[PDB]
């Protein structure tokens, strides 16, 4: 029903250009919508989604793996058709711990291997908020170890800045396949994106709607909002909604998107974005929305070594970002 194209990774594998996000939010982690997430996942797989993005931190690996196993039992997919990502959090940054974190995630998900595993953030932080000051290069030796053990078909990073990427690419034995980071119309990350793509690292955009959608549109957050006349106008021109223009723009930059939704019509809508070329004029308009506004800026991590973003001077990590139970 939907046909999702694939980008090629620097390790020979394919990654679908759109994936299904599974984080429900600290909006106190909110488990209420788990059933809707699962039912919208099952529907996503029925219509042709294959890429699923998840993480230890998202609490729901056991439930995702159950859905996956059901879809395989029903004959809708084989394992080999799916691209599944998970991620290792900040308390498992010693080299030997990557294997423990990932084997556990793999047990939760019910899998022999994932397609991709990421270093969720470059900071090394204990469960009590101690900065363990472990170099991400040491952590990366563990990613390289779990790769050689066949626990994952690919290794990557998330929230690495251009400096961290450069240092990682200069020192690694196996390069990262992806850098997963925030990209949207207000935060284009042009330089980081260009640097990644010049080095054959694929960029995967989380929070691809930024503050455009009403769930995140807090006042004085920037345009575009869903009513934006220029967005709507670009919409009418190619026969698309505003969210579809947004995702198609990212697609057209060669960037993979992982929107999140619990709503089946959005699942379907989000995937109908591969049949239009935005022209030079509309690209230039869309580029004008870029203004450095970061939707996801966890100020509690500023003091840690390897915090990746620019520090706002003059500023306790909540418990839900350090300790939790799964399933
Ligand atoms: N590596 C990292 O550090 C991070 C990774 N992520 C990952 O990426 C995903 C990224 O998305 P996220 O940050 O959740 O935010 P998104 O930009 O995906 O937006 C989520 C919101 O958009 C709404 N929505 C989705 N589709 C549409 C549509 N077509 N029209 C109108 N509204 C829509 C949803 O509503 P509803 O659900 O009610 O339909 C939801 O409230 C996460 O699920 C996770 O997988 C996220 C943050 C950090
Ligand atoms: Ca498997």
SS (H, E, C) 64-93: HHHHHHHHHHCCCCCHHHCEEEEEECCCCC
Query: How many Å lie between the centroid of ligand 2 and the Cα of residue 1?
Result: 25
Separation between Cα atoms, residue 88 and residue 106, nearest integer Å = 11
Separation between Cα atoms, residue 179 and residue 161, nearest integer Å = 9
For 280-287, the CB contacts below 8 A with 24+ separation are 282/234, 282/237, 283/249, 283/252, 285/230, 285/234, 286/185, 286/234, 286/245, 286/249, 287/188
Q: What pairing do the DSSP bridges indicate for beta strands 20-21 and 51-53?
A: parallel
For the CA of 209, the closest atom of ligand 1 is 17
* DSSP string computed for 181-208: EE-SSS---HHHHHHHHHTTPEEEEEST
Separation between Cα atoms, residue 73 and residue 77, nearest integer Å = 8
As a whole number of Å, the CA-based R_g of the chain is: 19
What determination technique applies here? Answer: X-ray
Query: How many Å lie between the centroid of ligand 2 and the Cα of residue 322?
Result: 28
The answer regarding whether domain 1-327 maps to CATH 3.20.20.100 reads yes
Every domain of the chain and the residues it spans: 1-327
Phi, psi of 68, deg, nearest 5? -60, -45
Phi, psi of 253, deg, nearest 5? -75, 5
Separation between Cα atoms, residue 322 and residue 139, nearest integer Å = 18
* Contact assessment for residue 182 and residue 188, using Cβ atoms and an 8 Å cutoff: no
Query: How many Å lie between the centroid of ligand 1 and the Cα of residue 243?
Result: 12
HSE on the CB side for 227, CA within 13 Å? 2
Pocket lining: 179 vs ligand 1, CB cutoff 6 Å = no
Resolution in angstroms for this experimental structure?
Answer: 2.3
Does the active-site annotation cover 58? yes
Closest CA to 204 of 227, 178, 243: 178
* DSSP string computed for 296-319: ---GGGTTSTT--SPP-S-----G
Pocket lining: 263 vs ligand 1, CB cutoff 6 Å = yes
Helix (H) / strand (E) element for 40: namely helix 34-47
DSSP state of 174: S
* Contact assessment for residue 222 and residue 211, using Cβ atoms and an 8 Å cutoff: yes
* Contact assessment for residue 200 and residue 170, using Cβ atoms and an 8 Å cutoff: no
Query: How many Å lie between the centroid of ligand 2 and the Cα of residue 191?
Result: 36
Closest CA to 254 of 274, 224, 230: 274
* Contact assessment for residue 245 and residue 231, using Cβ atoms and an 8 Å cutoff: yes
Cβ neighbours, 10 Å, residue 295: 17
Catalytic residue, candidates 20, 49, 58, 251: 58
Pocket lining: 294 vs ligand 1, CB cutoff 6 Å = no
Extract the tokens encoding 159: 């929230």
Closest CA to 271 of 17, 8, 6: 17
Taking the alpha carbons at both ends of the chain, their separation in whole angstroms is: 31
Calculate the dihedral angle through the C-alpha atoms of 20, 21, 22, 24, rounding to the nearest 10 degrees. Answer: -140
Pocket lining: 209 vs ligand 1, CB cutoff 6 Å = yes
């Amino acid at each position: 029903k939907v046909n999702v194209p694939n980008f090629k990774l620097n390790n020979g594998d394919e990654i679908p250009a759109l994936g299904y996000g599974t984080w429900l939010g600290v909006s106190d982690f909110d488990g209420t919508d788990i059933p809707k997430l699962l039912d919208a996942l099952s529907y996503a797989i029925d219509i042709g989604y294959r890429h699923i993005d998840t993480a230890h931190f998202y609490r729901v690996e056991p439930e995702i793996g159950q859905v996956v196993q059901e879809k395989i039992n029903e004959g809708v997919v084989r394992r080999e058709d799916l691209f599944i990502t998970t991620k290792v959090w900040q308390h498992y940054h010693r080299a030997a711990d990557v294997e423990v974190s990932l084997r556990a995630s793999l047990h939760r998900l019910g899998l022999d291997h994932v397609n991709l595993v990421l270093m969720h953030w470059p900071m090394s932080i204990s469960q009590e908020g101690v900065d363990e000051k472990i170099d991400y290069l040491e952590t990366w030796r563990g990613f390289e170890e779990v790769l050689k053990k066949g626990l994952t078909k690919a290794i990557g990073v998330s929230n690495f800045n251009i400096e961290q990427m450069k240092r990682l690419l200069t020192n690694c034995n196996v390069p990262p396949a992806v850098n997963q980071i925030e990209v949207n119309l207000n935060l284009s990350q042009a330089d980081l994106v260009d640097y990644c793509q010049a080095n054959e690292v694929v960029v995967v955009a989380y929070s691809p709607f930024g503050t455009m959608v009403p769930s995140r549109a807090t006042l004085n957050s920037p345009e575009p909002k869903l009513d934006n006349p220029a967005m709507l106008a670009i919409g009418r021109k190619y026969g698309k909604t505003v969210t579809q223009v947004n995702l198609g723009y990212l697609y057209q930059r060669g960037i993979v998107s992982i929107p999140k939704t619990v709503t089946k019509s959005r699942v379907l809508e989000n995937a109908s974005i591969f049949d239009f070329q935005l022209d030079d004029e509309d690209v230039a308009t869309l580029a004008q929305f870029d203004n450095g506004f970061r939707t996801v800026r966890p100020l509690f991590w500023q003091p840690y070594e390897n915090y990746p973003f620019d520090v706002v001077p003059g500023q306790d990590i909540p418990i839900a970002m350090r300790k939790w139970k799964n399933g």
